[PDB]
Design a protein around this ligand. Structure first.
Ligand SMILES: CCCCCCCCCCCCCCCCCC(=O)OC[C@H](COP(=O)([O-])OCC(O)COP(=O)([O-])OC[C@@H](COC(=O)CCCCCCCCCCCCCCCCC)OC(=O)CCCCCCCCCCCCCCCCC)OC(=O)CCCCCCCCCCCCCCCCC
Ligand code: BCL
Ligand code: BCL
Ligand code: BCL
Ligand code: BCL
Ligand code: BCL
Ligand SMILES: CC[C@H]1c2cc3[nH]c4c(c3C)C(=O)[C@H](C(=O)OC)c4c3nc(cc4[nH]c(cc(n2)[C@@H]1C)c(C(C)=O)c4C)[C@@H](C)[C@@H]3CCC(=O)OC/C=C(\C)CCC[C@H](C)CCC[C@H](C)CCCC(C)C
Ligand SMILES: COC(C)(C)C/C=C/C(C)=C/C=C/C(C)=C/C=C/C(C)=C\C=C\C=C(C)\C=C\C=C(/C)CC/C=C(\C)CCC=C(C)C
Ligand SMILES: CCCCCCCCCCCC[N+](C)(C)[O-]
Ligand SMILES: CCCCCCCCCCCC[N+](C)(C)[O-]
Ligand SMILES: CCCCCCCCCCCC[N+](C)(C)[O-]
Ligand SMILES: [Cl-]
Ligand SMILES: [Fe+2]
Lengths: 301, 238, 281
């Protein structure tokens, strides 16, 4: 008999929202997309519009090329048989060059060259997309927090497939493109380095990953709990504290004696998440380059 | 050893980050006070952070925090014990005096504005193009209180224009006047809208808005605070 | 001490047990009946751990470890120094966590807010009880539970996992990991979005939620919205923990072989099982 505000009871709709203009080149915005009543029960029903300038186009082109380069290799391994493609879809894998080739680009297409090509497309797609997170915020006069947080995820990605392989001396150290294969690579990486549970950066990384679910469950629940006081209108609660923000602060002060403000909790949010891939990248980078066996390392230092 | 230096350095960084986070979360509510409103002796281990200033749009000024704090409203409560740490009993009607779970903050007495400077929330009849797009349309349904008696009828939905969502239900009472009910506090059913937080006889007491086509931040707080306070104080009639 | 706006909320009422008996605060902390219960369970538990440490022969936080009864004890009780203490401490922990949840409910009632927080915390508790209660009882012995030690419990994780090969192949574990990754992604984005609007480029005015929707729509062609993002974070968060619990409640019970081999049912499907070529042919 008491609504919980998890799903909406009634949806309302008005003219398609084309968004704020600011310094955005409207010529690069698409038209609005379809409205989804299904999505409207949980969140917004409106799809689009999206902004696609030159950089965006470049990013989607590389992204797709990356995906298709791997897909072509898969069909090949499947002997071009549709039934085999689906059957072993998770077993197919585009692997990097063998150690023998070091960091060169001389490896044959079916023996590393194709992995390098795919990786080149991924490199361009990811970094150009990073440019988008920065520029889309700049055009709207917004802070660059999103581009900075994204850079943290990019750090772990860069370390795994580019920076560490280079410091190790060969592309063979990089991660392969495959569902089961990248899992196998992950398990093997830990085995070869003496168990990552002995890598302090790995364990901190875990504390932050768990911490992120801990914090978002806390935050999501808190805001919904005070949504009856307009709590989710966070920007205005920051600019003019309401009873929603006061009750949220007191809930946590009375429960665990925490200091809490509407803006401050979002600083806990961005950092808790960002630290996952930040501590993680350092942990991976140090593996093999400076520390061969974390267990052995832990016994000394 | 580079690994030792890195992890050692990281813990230092981490200690600084936690210090920063703790102080950032002190921009509202500090300095701490005694139950009588005076500055408390123990202000905690962290000092207040240097003030920061937010520039508010639409010429509404700025906000600087931390800054001088004051309720800017009367608080109808009184001590129930001779020492700190105990409850403070309402001196009158808590629902009417706005204390306890029925509290409200003295927010700006102006409406929240969207990115274009227009009122963010408007009754649907006054919002061009807006209409119900899914679910049971509550407009026209009778409103029932926790005492299982009908208190009024839904005459409109107040929507958030920029975010296209229902925020309040406008309810007409027997005397012809209307009141706003938080969308998060009503249950829309097939033949009625049920309100568990209030008994029929408490609807007339819901704070009213000065202008019929807009609601200020101050008014929203008084309305939302009042309705929520019914869960505890209307209990006898539930 | 109290926050500058705190007094108006410190009224009587909301308790679930004891009336006004325990309706008071200690510094910033609210007490209530379950505040006392929490203290009781927590105190007794910590004391029993200190005792266990004495019987273990160490006071080092990095070494203190309380292990559950050996498998030979089944689901029966065991001597205190041989699993018994673990059993009592587990009862205390459960009591403390549950009491903490109910204390949150009392706080919710006094503040007039929804019960989402304690409801969400219950999922964490259920994940805990899955590891020390439901799974062990299903497998037939307390010994299958993890020990209470900072480092020893990681040994349990590693040993329990490899007991089934590379645990990565547990399908429910794959779903759980996905929710954890997606959650961190959304937490990073949510924090970054709100902050980028409240702290714009130097000298500019604060942005509006209108700008938040616009930014994300320009970026990916969609915005779940101000209310949606908090609903999403709660959903991703709890779903992650729900599938974690599910991935373990089925391990050692309905499936106890190597998880990698479970995936063979798809490869062995009649219509393509024998077609030459590929990886499995
Ligand atoms: C090896 C490492 C390699 C890793 C590379 C991966 C990169 C990941 C970086 C992630 C950072 C973003 C996090 C989010 C954030 O708040 O930033 C927004 C912030 C503002 O965005 P904006 O739109 O420019 O501003 C809008 C407003 O004008 C202004 O808006 P605002 O106020 O919201 O932002 C101001 C913000 C400014 O934020 C920053 O400048 C970030 C600080 C840099 C830290 C980077 C990680 C370093 C890790 C150290 C570990 C060493 C081991 C190796 O203030 C802070 O957050 C301060 C941070 C507190 C740190 C405490 C330092 C402790 C030192 C020790 C003292 C001991 C005392 C004990 C007691 O971004 C930045 O200031 C720039 C950071 C760029 C880093 C580039 C690195 C190049 C590669
Ligand atoms: C969840 C699946 C596995 C598990 C797998 C792992 C792995 C893998 C890792 C940890 C790590 C940790 N685990 Mg464990 N661990 C589990 C069950 C638990 C339980 C429990 C009662 O159910 C507890 C209390 C802990 C606690 C801990 C921390 C010591 C440490 C970092 C936690 C963190 O930030 O988390 C997120 C939560 C928060 C950010 C909130 C803050 C809470 C913290 C600070 C409370 C810790 C209390 C601790 C000192 C014990 C208190 C006992 C006293 C007697 C009262 N684990 C189960 C068995 N855990 C990491 C570690 O570094 O280990 C050494 C690590 O790499
Ligand atoms: C389900 C989604 C989320 C999440 C949702 C939430 C929500 C929501 C809430 C919490 C809250 C809590 N969460 Mg969390 N949380 C998650 C994951 C974690 C993990 C982890 C390892 O991942 C940890 C360690 C924690 C820890 C915590 C505590 C800080 C806090 C509960 C305090 C309490 O019961 O005190 C009472 C008990 C005591 C004070 C101590 C009793 C100690 C005795 C009896 C000894 C037992 C020790 C033994 C079992 C373990 C020791 C050994 C270790 C393995 C080394 N959460 C998951 C991922 N969590 C609540 C909160 O207050 O947060 C601030 C809260 O509202
Ligand atoms: C047997 C397995 C080993 C294991 C070996 C590894 C290895 C190896 C690594 C980890 C890493 C991690 N491990 Mg470990 N680890 C194990 C045990 C565990 C346990 C456990 C409970 O037992 C836990 C909780 C964890 C937890 C974790 C994470 C904290 C961390 C990854 C963070 C992350 O978000 O990555 C996910 C985030 C990313 C990968 C970033 C991706 C970024 C961007 C750029 C993506 C671009 C995508 C785009 C182009 C694709 C487009 C798709 C379209 C939308 C369609 N590990 C054991 C001991 N672990 C990582 C780490 O940091 O270690 C320190 C790591 O490399
Ligand atoms: C951190 C240590 C390891 C690692 C350890 C693990 C472990 C352990 C697990 C995963 C899992 C996943 N990992 Mg991995 N993974 C690593 C780095 C990556 C990188 C990368 C670019 O660096 C990518 C793209 C992936 C992607 C994948 C996905 C297949 C799967 C779900 C991820 C997720 O929910 O993301 C969050 C982001 C979103 C959900 C946004 C939406 C995008 C979705 C669709 C993910 C991309 C899928 C895409 C790459 C291809 C699928 C197409 C096929 C035709 C079916 N991993 C590193 C190398 N990863 C889980 C899984 O189910 O494995 C099968 C899993 O259990
Ligand atoms: C070598 C080990 C195996 C493997 C072995 C297993 C095993 C075994 C398990 C997991 C489980 C987990 N693994 Mg695995 N895991 C592997 C690789 C990984 C990788 C990776 C990148 O490779 C990742 C990301 C994961 C991630 C996952 C998660 C899905 C899950 C842990 C979270 C959880 O259960 O929380 C749930 C949250 C909690 C239990 C915390 C609850 C705490 C509450 C109630 C209160 C505590 C408070 C108190 C003590 C506070 C102190 C007091 C005051 C604060 C002062 N695994 C490898 C291959 N994995 C676990 C799981 O699913 O457990 C259910 C698990 O048991
Ligand atoms: C901070 C740590 C976490 C993180 C953060 C993060 N991810 C990011 C960003 C941030 C802040 C975004 O700005 C960017 C984004 O645009 O999100 C919508 C992104 C993003 N992270 C993505 C995926 C991703 N992130 C992941 C992980 C994480 N992201 C960590 C948990 C993972 C996995 C495996 O856990 C994946 C698969 C994309 C959806 C998006 C980057 C899109 C991109 O580079 O596209 C290039 C390819 C195409 C254009 C093909 C079409
Ligand atoms: C259905 O059919 C078609 C063909 C149409 C499409 C089907 C396609 C399919 C089935 C695609 C499947 C794709 C899969 C399964 C992809 C999986 C990818 C995975 C799991 C994981 C990746 C982890 C990746 C990492 C860590 C990559 C890091 C890469 C980099 C850091 C790039 C480094 C750049 C290099 C090496 C290039 C050199 C660069 C310069 C500038 C010199
Ligand atoms: C840009 C990526 C370089 C690709 C290398 C291909 C070389 N080779 C010898 C296989 O033909
Ligand atoms: C900004 C968020 C801060 C909270 C993080 C909690 C840290 C957990 C401590 C355990 C890690 C110990 N170590 C070095 C072995 O990894
Ligand atoms: C919700 C139920 C809470 C109970 C959790 C406690 C589990 C450990 C109990 C050990 C009991 C020993 N024995 C057989 C003598 O009963
Ligand atoms: Cl919160
Ligand atoms: Fe938020």
């Amino acid at each position: 008999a008491e609504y919980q505000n998890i799903f909406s009871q009634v949806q309302v709709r008005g003219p398609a929202d084309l968004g704020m203009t600011e310094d955005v080149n409207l010529a690069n915005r698409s038209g609005v997309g379809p409205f989804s009543t299904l999505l409207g029960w949980f969140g917004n029903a409106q799809l689009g519009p999206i902004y696609l300038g030159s950089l965006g186009v470049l990013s989607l082109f590389s992204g797709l090329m990356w995906f298709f380069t791997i897909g072509i290799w898969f069909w090949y391994q499947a002997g071009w048989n549709p039934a085999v493609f689906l059957r072993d879809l998770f077993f197919f894998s585009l692997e990097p060059p063998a150690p023998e080739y070091g960091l060169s680009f001389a490896a044959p297409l079916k023996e590393g060259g194709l992995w390098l090509i795919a990786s080149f497309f991924m490199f361009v797609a990811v970094w150009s997309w990073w440019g988008r997170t920065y520029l889309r915020a700049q055009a709207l006069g917004m802070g660059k927090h999103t581009a900075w947080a994204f850079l943290s995820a990019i750090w772990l990605w860069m370390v795994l497939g580019f920076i560490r392989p280079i410091l190790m001396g060969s592309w063979s150290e990089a991660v392969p493109y495959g569902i089961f294969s990248h899992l196998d690579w992950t398990n093997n990486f830990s085995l070869v380095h003496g168990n990552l549970f002995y890598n302090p950066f790995h364990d901190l990384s875990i504390a932050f990953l768990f911490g992120s679910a801990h914090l978002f469950a806390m935050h999501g629940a808190t805001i919904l709990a005070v949504s009856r006081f307009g709590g989710e209108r966070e920007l205005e609660q920051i600019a003019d504290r309401g009873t929603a923000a006061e009750r949220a602060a007191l809930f946590w002060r009375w429960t665990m004696g925490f200091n809490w403000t509407m803006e401050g909790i979002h600083r806990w949010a961005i950092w808790m998440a960002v630290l996952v891939t930040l501590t993680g990248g350092i942990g991976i980078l140090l593996s093999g380059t400076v520390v061969d066996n974390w267990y052995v390392w832990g016994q000394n230092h | 050893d580079l690994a030792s230096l890195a992890i050692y350095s990281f813990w230092i960084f981490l200690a600084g980050l936690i210090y920063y986070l703790q102080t950032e979360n002190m921009r509202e509510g500090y300095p701490l006070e005694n139950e009588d409103g005076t500055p408390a002796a123990n202000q905690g281990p962290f000092p207040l952070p240097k003030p920061k200033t937010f520039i508010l749009p639409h010429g509404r000024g700025t906000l600087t925090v931390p800054g001088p704090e004051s309720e800017d409203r009367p608080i109808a409560l009184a001590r129930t014990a001779v020492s700190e740490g105990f409850p403070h009993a309402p001196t009158g009607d808590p629902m009417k005096d706005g204390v306890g779970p029925a509290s409200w903050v003295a927010r700006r007495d102006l409406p929240e504005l969207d990115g274009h400077g227009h009122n963010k929330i408007k009754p649907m009849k006054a919002a061009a193009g807006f209409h119900v797009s899914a679910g049971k349309n509550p407009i026209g349904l009778p409103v029932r209180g926790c005492d299982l008696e009908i208190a009024g009828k839904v005459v409109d939905i107040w929507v958030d224009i920029p975010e296209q969502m229902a925020r309040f239900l406008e309810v007409e009472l027997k005397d012809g006047s209307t009141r706003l009910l938080p969308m998060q506090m009503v249950k829309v059913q097939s033949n009625r809208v049920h309100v568990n937080a209030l008994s029929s006889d408490l609807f007339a007491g819901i704070p009213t808005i000065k202008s019929p086509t807009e609601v200020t931040l101050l008014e929203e707080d008084k309305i939302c605070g009042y309705v929520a306070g019914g869960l505890m104080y209307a209990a006898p009639k539930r | 001490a109290l926050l500058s706006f705190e007094r108006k909320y410190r009224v009587p009422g909301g308790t679930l047990v004891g009336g006004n008996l325990f309706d008071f605060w200690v510094g910033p902390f609210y007490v209530g009946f379950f505040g006392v219960a929490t203290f009781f369970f927590a105190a007794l538990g910590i004391i029993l751990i200190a005792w266990s440490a004495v019987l273990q022969g160490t006071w080092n936080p990095q070494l203190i470890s309380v292990y559950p009864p050996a498998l030979e004890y089944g689901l029966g009780g065991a001597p205190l120094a041989k699993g018994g203490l673990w059993q009592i401490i587990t009862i205390c922990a459960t009591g403390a966590f549950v009491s903490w949840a109910l204390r949150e409910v009392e706080i919710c009632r006094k503040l007039g807010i929804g019960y989402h927080i304690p409801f969400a915390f219950a999922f964490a508790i259920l994940a805990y009880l899955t590891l020390v209660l439901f799974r062990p009882v299903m497998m037939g012995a307390w010994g299958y539970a993890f020990p209470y030690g900072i480092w020893t419990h990681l040994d349990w994780v590693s040993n329990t996992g490899y007991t089934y090969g590379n645990f990565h192949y547990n399908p429910a574990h794959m779903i759980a990991i996905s929710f954890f990754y997606t959650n961190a992604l959304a937490l990073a984005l949510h924090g970054a979005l709100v902050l980028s609007a409240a702290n714009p480029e130097k000298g500019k005015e604060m942005r509006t939620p209108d700008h938040e929707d616009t930014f994300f729509r320009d970026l990916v062609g969609y915005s779940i919205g101000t209310l949606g993002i908090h609903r999403l974070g709660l959903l991703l968060s709890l779903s992650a923990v729900f599938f974690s619990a599910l991935c373990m409640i089925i391990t050692g019970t309905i499936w106890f072989d190597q998880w990698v081999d479970w995936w063979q049912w798809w490869v062995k499907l009649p219509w393509w099982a024998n077609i030459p070529g590929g990886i499995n042919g």
